[PDB]
């Protein structure tokens, strides 16, 4: 093979939707997935080709796109970036180890588990503060920990945080380690350090929620992006390089706007179709 | 018992999510029911997941909701219900044209989502009824795959943004038909039952015109199912809320499309339901 009409990078909701549409449009398409819902099986049924590999780079020459993977170079007329995004990590001991065992990056998903429990939120932006306020509705107490001398969130949210009794705001503080229990292995405490006095502090917590930014997986593409790595596109998901599109969390969308992976995927596939049938 | 902690009106994604969360919060909750576009069975999963969780569902019709000292009275055709908190999750539906053949040919050529049905109308003829950003955007969308697109609007000009109108201007395979009103959608007499034609009428000259079309996409507004509640709304009838999904009535919340919401996507609906349940929980405990 080697040559294809369309190559979709990412096997998330955006990519899978793009693949299904493209196949129904009758395009020769391949999805590149880094590792293995129903969506997946559903896609396979439609007749999507998927290959477990990793993309290292993507270059465009003469109306052709060169995708270099560990398996070898691949060629395509059009490309869809659907690589999503990941939460930025604290990079401290116990974070990766206690994930799904007290450490989390979604406060709304784990709300009920921490009812009447003690909880810590790390971050200073609207996300950290919003979810600290959220968790305060259900948790006994919430520690909001930030490394700077002030919060970066909007004044309106900061005022609400001051308002709430059961939120304790700890500024000028950075996390040294998340320590867990004696089975079951779950979060038990966190060690803090004052950024100025180097003084240590131990806080008993049942959970730790981390909100220190989001990282879009777009380092391998050289299209136009915003300050943060999110790919800029038009209403048809087209990037700054004609023939290349982007869909899902890896794309540059306004804050108020939440996930629209399926819509982005659907549109990206038909915009690509229009592009292919013209070349 | 006629008394509950929380009552959720609507068994959609938002309501079912709210119910699941609420049960996990340990509240006595009941759902009132009447009776993802990639094509999947995810709605039933919510119900099963729900049943397993332990949420209560009853089939009934709600007529009104009034507050009487932090107590919420839900009056149904079956009788009055009592609750400490209420969540409105009744969703919304696209407005219909109200012409012959529309209801009969739904899922057989008539649709309200062009993005959902894109691949089916590849190399086919298509008609879009409407004049707003949605109708024009989806007309442009369909022109990328369809042979021909009729963009039909009843007014003398389009209400959509200029950038979208300029695009519609060429784009050779879109024909813009203004001052035009749909009289009927007619289906095939022979063969598989599908849309075959649409009858148009010029609003000014009363001249009629037949158009052969394989599909009709309708965009003439969205209707939130919120006439049975007397909380604060916009001219839409969309229920106004704060960040925590709370309505103008303390103790009453709203989630999903029935609410005044930036996005109508499923994830948002689930998110609204989750948040609404925890906001209600906080309200119930505090009092």
Numbering used by the authors:
A (entry chain C): 2 to 37, 64 to 208, 210 to 307
B (entry chain A): 2 to 36, 56 to 307
Paste lines from the article.
Thioredoxins (Trxs) participate in dithiol/disulfide exchange reactions that effect structural and functional changes in target proteins via reversible change in the redox state of selected cysteine (Cys) residues. Based on phylogenetics, protein structure, and molecular mechanism, two groups of NTRs are recognized: (i) Bacteria, plants, lower eukaryotes, and archaea contain low-molecular weight (LMW)-NTRs of about 35 kDa with a non-covalently bound flavin adenine dinucleotide (FAD) cofactor. These enzymes accept reducing equivalents from NADPH and transfer them to a redox-active disulfide motif (CxxC) that subsequently reduces Trx to its sulfhydryl form in a dithiol–disulfide exchange reaction. Thereby, according to the protein sequence comparison, MmNTR is classified as a canonical LMW-NTR.
Protein crystals of MmNTR were obtained, and the X-ray structure was solved and refined to a resolution of 2.6 Å. The X-ray structure shows that MmNTR is a homodimer, in agreement with the gel filtration data, with a structural organization that is analogous to other LMW-NTRs. Monomers consist of two Rossmann-fold domains that functionally correspond to FAD- and NADPH-binding domains. The redox motif CxxC (residues 132–136) is located on helix- α3 within the NADPH domain, with the two Cys forming a disulfide bridge in the crystal. Remarkably, no electron density of FAD or any other molecule was found at the presumed cofactor-binding pocket. The MmNTR structure thus represents the apo-form of the flavoprotein. The largest structural variations were found in a region next to the FAD-binding pocket, the so-called FAD-loop, which encompasses residues Ile37 through Pro55 (in red), that lacks a defined electron density in the apo-structure and is, therefore, omitted from the final MmNTR model. The NADPH-binding domain is positioned in an orientation with respect to the FAD-binding domain that exposes the NADPH-binding site to the bulk solvent and approaches the CxxC motif over the re-face of the isoalloxazine ring of the presumed flavin cofactor. This arrangement corresponds to the flavin-oxidizing (FO) conformation of NTRs that allows for the interaction of the disulfide bridge of the CxxC motif with the isoalloxazine ring of the flavin in a conformation competent for the reduction of the disulfide. By contrast, the FAD-binding domains slide up to the dimer interface of MmNTR with the consequent loss of α-helix contacts. Subsequently, the two domains in MmNTR are differently positioned each to the other with respect to canonical NTRs. This modification is likely a consequence of the loss of FAD, which results in the structural destabilization of the region comprising residues 36 to 68 that disrupts the dimer interface.
